[PDB]
């Protein structure tokens with residue numbers, strides 16, 4: 001209850017939110033039904049419109065006007081944005097040549113260049129090129145400032161999760177806004193687009209930029225705008241706030257546009273009706289820049305033009321219905337549309353079973369346009385699992401489709417032609433980034449990057465310490481002229497041991513055999529050299545990975561590969577090897593098919609054993625360095641050491657073998673050699689972060705051999721592929737993946753076919769950043785290169801997306 005009997009006189013868009021039951025006048029009061037009686041009259045003036053005309057010039061101030069063309073308007077801070085153009089012979093900002101802004105040019109009393117965030121809903125990346133004719137203001141920011149060809153949103157590519165990811169630098173799983181619609185089972189409360197629950201603070205995790213600023217003494221404009229406040233009023237309010245006295249003036253501001261998203265839903269991303277909303281956005285950008293120029297701020301303020309997600313063609317007739325798959329359709333609740341989330345309709349129903357739901361949804365129709373997952377088996381690059389608000393069952397919907405529960409949900413709930421929400425690597429969901437200002441670079445294109453990285457840079461722009469977040473601070477330093485953040489590499493926490501030969505063969509009782517009793521200082525001094533590290537600079541091109549937690553592990557050298565072998569997990573944390581363009585693939589000799597060899601550098605007590613794999617009817621084993629790529633028959637024996645073995649389900653050995661036998665060589669052929677680092681990942685609580693040993697839920701039967709949830713590989717080569725991977729003088733090129741280690745290939749509907757028709761497609765879906773592997777393994781890669789640390793941070797955030 002508000003006593004809406006007070007007045008907004010001189011309080012319009014006040015920056016303190018006064019507490020009930022004084023009446024409110026802030027840009028949010030409408031949404032709370034709490035505005036003073038006279039809010040509309042005083043604060044939402046519209047008389048005479050938004051532009052000065054020739055006859056208004058020098059007018060007598062009339063306070064009823066939406067904006068002013070009188071002589072006192074510059075000092076009152078409330079001229080129409082085109083005042084100087086119309087009345088003082090000035091040019092529009094878009095008509096001025098662009099001129100490098102080397103230093104901030106700010107009025108006296110400004111302590112730092114203000115930051116203005118101009119955010120646009122549904123602004124698809126390809127609008128920058130495709131709409132460029134009708135957006136001259138936006139085109140000027142883009143070509144004169146710093147721009148990326150596109151910016152990757154987070155999953156799901158829905159509005160609330162992405163705008164709040166922009167504000168916090170966090171994945172939705174960590175900030176808690178995991179959809180536009182949510183149920184939280186602990187609160188027992190629902191979050192909806194319509195209604196008052198969504199305003200409650202307990203949904204909103206993390207620390208958004210306006211709170212980070214405020215706590216550090218930087219004042220912030222209010223980020224939220226009621227839908228019915230016209231764009232022109234939002235702009236004039238920002239400019240008014242920029243004329244406040246020094247002690248009252250914010251340093252950071254946001255503008256938000258519901259367009260082009262709003263028309264994109266009705267007309268599709270490229271409908272002919274979309275040209276108007278692009279013109280209109282651009283005209284708003286021009287009003288802002290004209291208004292800044294008037295206040296002498298156009299070479300002082302940093303502007304970010306940034307979208308939340310793109311927009312795809314999606315129509316009612318491209319809907320899949322769960323009623324065509326499930327017999328028990330009324331026992332589930334579905335969150336529907338461009339993603340699916342399924343939970344039980346009632347917790348009192350003990351006949352509910354996720355396994356039979358998943359199975360009824362798996363590979364059931366030839367053209368099926370969604371795929372079911374338990375949330376922990378989603379591609380780790382989505383980081384969409386670690387939150388009680390994300391339902392255990394997830395459907396990843398193909399681009400251009402919806403999923404709904406029953407046909408009656410579509411016709412009695414076409415009505416629309418565009419939507420978004422799909423997988424964040426989809427081209428149509430990509431969005432935009434431009435920075436323009438003294439602190440951004442001049443006419444500089446930067447590579448695509450993810451929206452989780454912007455929060456750190458916004459903090460950098462405002463001299464703030466960011467709250468802990470999912471960006472990699474320093475990865476976007478190349479966007480900035482100054483204010484760069486200079487990180488240092490993390491300190492290694494555990495140092496390796498370098499074991500020599502310490503055990504005789506008969507000390508091992510592992511149930512392993514190898515047909516190897518077949519056998520000079522020519523070929524004998526040479527083998528000693530190889531076990532001491534003599535070929536280590538061929539196979540370890542960027543230094544050893546550092547271990548950033550407390551553990552016990554051994555470096556092991558071999559002719560063809562080097563490994564860091566964990567005595568705690570009984571297998572390598574990492575295995576590093578280089579395959580040149582010239583390398584040849586050989587088969588495993590007949591006699592050596594089941595060969596496993598004790599490693600005389602490593603105690604029986606810290607080794608796996610073959611018996612456990614024999615006794616374990618479900619689990620087999622594979623090798624991290626592939627026997628197929630051995631440099632010689634003799635070197636091949638090294639690949640069968642017990643210390644190169646890792647537990648693998650037969651189903652997963654199909655994927656791994658094809659990767660190792662076919663794909664590594666293919667990559668070495670195309671990239672002019674590749675360095676590969678491979679290893680296991682344990683993430684049983686699906687939090688994106690390395691498990692400690694007491695979190696492991698599965699072992700090889702009768703043993704202490706822990707079973708990985710995933711296997712990773714990082715594949716590096718020279719960005720200039722005229723140089724071979726092992727003699728590369730400049731920037732690197734990387735692709736990586738984190739394959740889920742699963743006992744079936746149910747994910748891959750074509751898997752009964754030959755691996756050439758399905759494995760590479762699985763791997764592409766599970767593409768990852770080196771940074772994703774860092775979090776999952778507690779390792780730090782690329783510690784010894786000739787590149788600057790900032791450039792290495794950017795390489796570690798790279799994602800190879802396989803889109804066109």
Ligand SMILES: *[C@@H]1O[C@H](CO)[C@@H](O[C@@H]2O[C@H](CO)[C@@H](O[C@@H]3O[C@H](CO[C@H]4O[C@H](CO[C@H]5O[C@H](CO)[C@@H](O)[C@H](O)[C@@H]5O)[C@@H](O)[C@H](O[C@H]5O[C@H](CO)[C@@H](O)[C@H](O)[C@@H]5O[C@H]5O[C@H](CO)[C@@H](O)[C@H](O)[C@@H]5O)[C@@H]4O)[C@@H](O)[C@H](O[C@H]4O[C@H](CO)[C@@H](O)[C@H](O)[C@@H]4O[C@H]4O[C@H](CO)[C@@H](O)[C@H](O)[C@@H]4O)[C@@H]3O)[C@H](O)[C@H]2NC(C)=O)[C@H](O)[C@H]1NC(C)=O
Pocket residue numbers: 170171173174175176202203204205206383386387388467468469470687688689775
């Ligand atoms: C992406 O980046 C993010 C952010 O960096 C990473 O997420 C962080 O990762 C940490 C490890 O998972 C985690 O540390 C936890 O935190 C526990 C305390 O957490 C609360 O406090 C947080 C701080 O708020 C304040 O921030 C500043 C200082 O930074 C202050 O000035 C202000 O005053 C702020 O208020 C807060 O952020 C956090 O919020 C979460 O939970 C809220 C609901 O309660 C949500 O609103 C919000 O959205 C957050 O939700 C996410 O995170 C939680 C995990 O916290 C998760 O469950 C949700 O699903 C969701 O994903 C809290 O309010 C701390 O107590 C923990 O310590 C335990 O474990 C250690 C083991 O070493 C023990 O020492 C300790 O005793 C304790 O164990 C005990 O408790 C156990 C139960 O957990 C029990 O089993 C056990 O037996 C013991 O009794 C631990 O440090 C961060 O909280 C988390 N931060 C955020 C924002 O998510 C993320 O990892 C990155 N992702 C990737 C892939 O890299």
Ligand SMILES: O=C(COc1ccc(OC(F)(F)F)cc1)N1C[C@H]2CN(C(=O)c3ccc4[nH]nnc4c3)C[C@@H]2C1
Pocket residue numbers: 117119121158159160163164166167180193209223224225226254255256261
């Ligand atoms: O006023 C703002 C600006 O809010 C920020 C926050 C952070 C922010 O972060 C920053 F600054 F870093 F960009 C920027 C603007 N609003 C965000 C709007 C989204 N709304 C929807 O109703 C909605 C729901 C589903 C949709 N699908 N498609 N479009 C959709 C739109 C109303 C909200 C009002």
Ligand SMILES: [Ca+2]
Pocket residue numbers: 682683684685686687688689690691
């Ligand atoms: Ca984990």
Ligand SMILES: [Cl-]
Pocket residue numbers: 158178179180181335
């Ligand atoms: Cl949602």
Ligand SMILES: [K+]
Pocket residue numbers: 613614615616617618619620
């Ligand atoms: K077995």
Ligand code: NA
Pocket residue numbers: 745746747748749750751752
């Ligand atoms: Na299959």
Ligand SMILES: [Zn+2]
Pocket residue numbers: 122159261262265420
């Ligand atoms: Zn939308």
